[PDB]
């Protein structure tokens, strides 16, 4: 996260870290949506242009963290995966359209003051909150500058941008399953996600019922915090039926 601040303890209890076993390294961010399912971005697992194709046995999920490199004894929980599900129409050949994946944990995790699931939006919540100008929050342990890693989880709040502006900032073909967020060069406020933050959550707090909902997943960007550029996110509500389907087909 570039131009963000250190998170407070228990601020994002649904934040998850995808960690590689050998070499031991941070791969991406992810989110807890129930006691057995984690949501992330498909490019964190599969990306053939770079010979990237991870399997169940190559990863670990670490839940309840704050510090980026330390094993937080008696606070965090480490789980193994049972199954990984990538969206059938994820487009890694052109623009990362439908960049979403679900992972099933071997055993359910127990909630605590540091581990709690986030809610998935319903049509009406999505309709009222995904509006240009409204702010969301992104969290992660990724880089601090484009070219500089934090010791603790970082946070930044960003506004959703109008679709025309998103489309005129790049040469990539944007689709209805993506939205972009960030400040305009003219707003004198900065912030963006960067390397290491992919797969993590973009959340909003409902003023109707006071709950936090996950509206997007960190997907792609061109550089980090560049002026005239924005970050792109997967639109969770437009892919929700896919989500419901695998969960009540493969578990709960």
């Amino acid at each position: 996260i570039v131009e963000g601040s250190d998170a407070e303890i228990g601020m994002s209890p649904w934040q998850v870290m995808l960690f590689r076993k050998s070499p031991q390294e941070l791969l991406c961010g992810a989110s807890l949506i129930s006691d057995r399912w984690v949501l992330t971005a498909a490019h964190c697992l599969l990306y053939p242009p770079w010979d990237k194709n991870f399997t169940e046995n190559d990863l670990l999920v670490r839940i309840g963290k704050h510090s980026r490199t330390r094993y937080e004894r008696n606070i965090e929980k480490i789980s193994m995966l049972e199954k990984i599900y990538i969206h059938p129409r994820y487009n890694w050949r052109e623009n990362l359209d439908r960049d979403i994946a679900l992972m099933k944990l071997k055993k359910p995790v127990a909630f605590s003051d540091y581990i709690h699931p986030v809610c998935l939006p319903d049509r009406e919540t999505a309709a009222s909150l995904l509006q240009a100008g409204y702010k969301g929050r992104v969290t992660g342990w990724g880089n601090l500058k484009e070219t500089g890693q934090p010791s603790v989880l970082q946070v930044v709040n960003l506004p959703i941008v109008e679709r025309p502006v998103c489309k005129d900032s790049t040469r990539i073909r944007i689709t209805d399953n993506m939205f972009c967020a960030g400040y305009k060069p003219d707003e004198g406020k900065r912030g963006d996600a960067c390397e290491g933050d992919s797969g993590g959550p973009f959340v909003m707090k409902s003023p109707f019922n006071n709950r936090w909902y996950q509206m997007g997943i960190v997907s792609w960007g061109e550089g980090c915090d560049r002026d005239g550029k924005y970050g792109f996110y997967t639109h969770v509500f437009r892919l929700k039926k896919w989500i419901q389907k695998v969960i009540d087909q493969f578990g709960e």
Partner: protein
């Protein structure tokens, strides 16, 4: 987990459950043309 939310999703132990707020959530609510 899925459909429209779940049981006690989105209510944090150390904040909403104790009626405590974090330092920048006000910035969000104030952008939904203000909340409360």
């Amino acid at each position: 987990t899925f459909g429209s939310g779940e049981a006690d999703c989105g209510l944090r132990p150390l904040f909403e459950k104790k009626s405590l707020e974090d330092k920048t959530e006000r910035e969000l609510l104030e952008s939904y043309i203000d909340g409360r």
